[PDB]
Design a protein around this nucleic acid. Structure first.
Lengths: 46, 66, 212, 52
RNA sequence: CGCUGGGUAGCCAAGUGCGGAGCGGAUAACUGCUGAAAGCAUCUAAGUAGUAAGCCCACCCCAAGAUGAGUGCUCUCCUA
RNA sequence: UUCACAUCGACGGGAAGGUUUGGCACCUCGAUGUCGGCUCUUCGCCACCUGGGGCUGUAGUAUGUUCCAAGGGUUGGGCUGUUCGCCCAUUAAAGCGGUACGUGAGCUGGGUUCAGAACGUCGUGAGACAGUUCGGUCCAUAUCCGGUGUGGGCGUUAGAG
RNA sequence: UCGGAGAGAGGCUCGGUGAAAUAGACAUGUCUGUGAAGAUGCGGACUACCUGCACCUGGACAGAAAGACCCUAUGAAGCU
RNA sequence: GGCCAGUGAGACGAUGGGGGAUAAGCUUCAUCGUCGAGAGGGAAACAGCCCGGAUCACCAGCUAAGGCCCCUAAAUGACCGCUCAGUGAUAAAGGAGGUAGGGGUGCAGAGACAGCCAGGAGGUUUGCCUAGAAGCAGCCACCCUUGAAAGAGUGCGUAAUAGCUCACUGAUCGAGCGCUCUUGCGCCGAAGAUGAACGGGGCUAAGCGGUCUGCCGAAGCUGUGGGAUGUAAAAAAACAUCGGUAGGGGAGCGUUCCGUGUUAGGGAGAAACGCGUGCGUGAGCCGCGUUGGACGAAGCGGAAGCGAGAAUGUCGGCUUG
RNA sequence: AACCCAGAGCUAGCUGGUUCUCCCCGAAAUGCGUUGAGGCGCAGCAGUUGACUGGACAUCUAGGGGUAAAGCACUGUUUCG
RNA sequence: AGGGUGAAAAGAACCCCCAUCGGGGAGUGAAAUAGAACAUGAAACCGUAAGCUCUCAAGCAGUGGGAGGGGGACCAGACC
């Protein structure tokens, strides 16, 4: 035989989810245009 | 008739839960009854018909049903 | 699915028929308390299968309840105790109105199968249910007649289902097969049949032709 | 998602957020999933103004 | 059972009967039939034939708590 | 006899398995009881036989080797505590292993060779030997799972046979 | 071989009397995988109505009892 | 420096090595990351692998790792190619007209490949051996001629011959045919003992490679509000911080007794025991009791036989079986 | 090498256990030495109180090397003419 | 190892059950639920009554959401 089985934390460096597609690493979050600031949350009315 | 099995099973599942209704709560039975006629003529793709096994087993060993 | 209608009769002891060639054969003697009247036929139209329903042991009306005797008087026949059907292929010509069928249909057919309640032996051990062996009777042994090992070691952690334990042995019906018929009696209402039927003299006994 | 998918034409939950942030609606906070069942004509007005 | 001699009914075998059937279905290895991708060929890529104590069914029994809780026949619900 | 590939295959190489002896010391020593036998399983195929086939330096019988196939079987004994093994009579064949000896909360002998004694050898001696021989207590009412039987309740949308 | 029958005392049922070892709480399945590398308790699947009685003991690394074997202690003791 | 602790059994992963058999979740070192002492998300489950550092609340939003058929949140999304083995979890040497390409080199409209048919002869049985060896048991070279081409022969066969047949050429139809390297994904090699056992169902895409847009996705970040620590030495306000084992420091609650105390209060119900739609960061306080019947608060202080879930603890009571 | 009492609450580098709350900080499993290896003393790394200090993190420059790579100029070793 | 009915035995006259033990009325007492096992009586433990709910169900028995139902209610939206 002479093939070692990959045990714990060697199983984790092999069988962890790795996204090995060079496209899907390039993705940043989407950017919307900036909006004007929202008004005050409330106002004193006397 | 001439519908493939697993995608039909998923689109029957998405109505059998109730995930096409806005009243979907996953703790109650908001689903819908479905009826599937012509189960004898369900299509499959590839080599499911001669290579996919619905094996079962009782508790005792040596009872795995081919 | 059976290959034809059968009858039912009671066991009345055993004896030996002397064949005129010189042989001595052990036969069981079958009596007939009452004729096996076809009570209810169930065809492919009004039922999912086809079977002919006969009965046996004409009795007193006090012995029989209202649904039983109402079912039997739906056919216009005598009130009788036992009641069994034979499933038969759809070529049948059987009226449920009092067909007192005579026992001539088995003599030329020199092969018959029989079913019956074997005699019960109660809660018996593994030494007679499943034909085990006993341990050493001597040499310092202690597991006389006991059940021995039950399972494997740690890796199952349980015992397999259907494992041969002691339990109630007899009481269920059995069918012994292809039993060759012998001298019927057209006046003694008695059929010789060479073999050994299940049970002591007195019990019900299915007597139906073979299924080979 | 189950409320938007009742249109029949292929409009997913992702496209409702496509044209929910492009048409500038700051942060309805998924309480349109509450008035999506308490006020289904009002969420039909929400979505039918997301289309235009 | 004082020790022996036999024995009916039970129980049992060493005794007595019976069973292991199927030109039934599909296959594994193999032999093929036409037969192309390379006008030759090849059991195969289309279709298809023989065939295993193996698989399933048939065989004997239990069996609708099979909560999917079946089907058929029949009886009974009255007085204020 | 010619002929690498009917059958063996030197010099070398590549694997699978975890059944031997090993390596590590990762669970267990406020206790995981080793070896053999009896009883009783069940499973694997790396096939001894049975069923089908290919090739044969297969004339036929019998083969040699190999493919599919684990349904079923795989004897009785003399020696030894024996596993293994030798031998006799055979048989279609008398397969190899896993399941913590598979199985000592089911059972008994050699042993982790316990306490007595003797022989050889070692030691000045007390004593000791992975040397030998005789004798040498082995517990247990099943709580739960698991199993084999056998009920009772309730359900099966009226209640039953 | 190769078991078989019968008689007692138990075992089973009823009436009386009535413990014990053990015990974190137990609403206490099987396979397979993972995990302190042998899981009813974690994961996936399958299977199981609830709850008794009588037997059997494969597991709960079952009960005992701070392993007699192995090693450590600048431990104890006997003996030479 | 002063006072004062633990720790000195480590583990895995990457790199650099030694021991081994470049075998071990093996052993010993050197730098680093995590666990130890680290919660959450992805990894089916699963200390050490990736993201990530948990003060607390919200029935808030945006994201990292990773995913978007169903179980289970988000795309049965779009456009190029590939795989037909359920490969998609797996291990090699080696084999292969598998399929999708790519680079070389050789033949063709003066007919290129595959099949049928025709020829394949003369010296010659080259010279040795053998009975024969005539190409076919073998040894040595292994010719030229007619020609369209023929090799002392490619194999079978025969006692040897004879003979069947091929490399090569001629002829009919006709337009692609070889033989090498090479990747991508595949096939076989590839077989275990209880039972699908590879998350499941399943899918020819829901698989594998290349891009494009969005969404889901943590206790991360942001937002809105509290608490505490450090600045800091009063308050307010500000900025930073606030996971934690062994351990260190600061601040507090409770208990019984004592000083005030022959305290206030109390047979118009004290302590106890039981109760809460109350308050605190919590240890706890306060309040209510058709129970009970005589003691005893708070505040400001002190002293402990001072706080219980563990010791095969121990003493009583009562279970299980 | 009896039992009881007493020294004796012998001794144990060993085992188990050591009880209320909140806040801040926060390791180590390394070296040396040891009749020592599962103990201990010191150093390393915590907590708190200070006294001197002006550094950390990025970038650049300068110094010694002899590792990786490489090479046969020394020491060996080796294939062929 | 085993203390504490009351302030005072004033310790239950008499009637019934009845062989006793004990129990219920009546009487003493401020209290008889202070009755001689007698003072406050907690937890484990054993029970009985009322409300909701479990017999296709896999679960360190919780927690977040909460179907259905029940109870008093007054900030009737709240609480259990």
């Amino acid at each position: 035989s002479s093939r070692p089985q990959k045990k714990g934390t060697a199983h984790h460096m092999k069988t962890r989810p790795k996204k090995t597609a060079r496209w899907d690493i390039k993705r940043g979050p989407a950017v919307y245009p900036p909006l004007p600031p929202l008004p005050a949350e409330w106002t004193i009315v006397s | 008739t001439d519908l493939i099995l697993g995608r039909m099973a998923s689109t029957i599942a998405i109505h059998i839960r109730g995930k096409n209704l806005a009243s979907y709560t996953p703790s109650v039975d908001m689903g819908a009854f479905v009826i599937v006629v012509n189960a004898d003529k369900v299509a499959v793709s590839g080599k499911k018909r001669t290579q996919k096994l619905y094996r079962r087993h009782s508790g005792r060993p040596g009872g795995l049903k081919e | 699915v059976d290959a034809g209608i059968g009858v039912m009769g009671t066991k009345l002891g055993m004896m030996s028929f002397f064949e005129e060639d010189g042989t001595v054969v052990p036969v069981t003697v079958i009596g007939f308390k009452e004729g096996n009247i076809v009570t209810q036929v169930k065809t492919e139209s009004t039922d999912g299968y086809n079977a002919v329903q006969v009965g046996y042991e004409r009795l007193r009306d006090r012995k029989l309840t209202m649904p039983e005797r109402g079912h039997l008087n739906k056919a216009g026949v005598i009130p009788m105790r036992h009641l069994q059907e034979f499933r038969l292929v759809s070529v049948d010509d059987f009226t449920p109105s009092q067909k007192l069928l005579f026992e001539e249909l088995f003599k030329e057919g020199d092969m018959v199968d029989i079913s019956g309640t074997t005699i019960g032996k109660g809660f018996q051990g593994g030494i007679k249910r499943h034909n085990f062996k006993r341990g050493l009777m001597t040499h310092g042994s202690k597991s006389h007649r006991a059940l021995g090992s039950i399972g494997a070691g740690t890796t199952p952690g349980h015992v397999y289902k259907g494992k041969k334990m002691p339990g109630r042995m007899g009481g269920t019906k059995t069918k012994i097969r292809k039993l060759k018929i012998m001298k019927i009696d057209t006046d003694l209402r008695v059929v010789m049949i060479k073999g050994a039927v299940p049970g002591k003299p007195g019990n019900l006994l299915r007597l139906a032709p073979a299924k080979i | 998602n189950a409320a938007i998918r009742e249109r029949g034409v292929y409009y997913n939950y992702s496209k409702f957020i496509h044209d929910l942030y492009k048409r500038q609606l700051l942060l309805n906070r998924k309480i349109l999933a509450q008035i999506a069942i308490l006020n289904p004509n009002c969420i039909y007005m929400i979505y039918n103004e997301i289309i235009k």
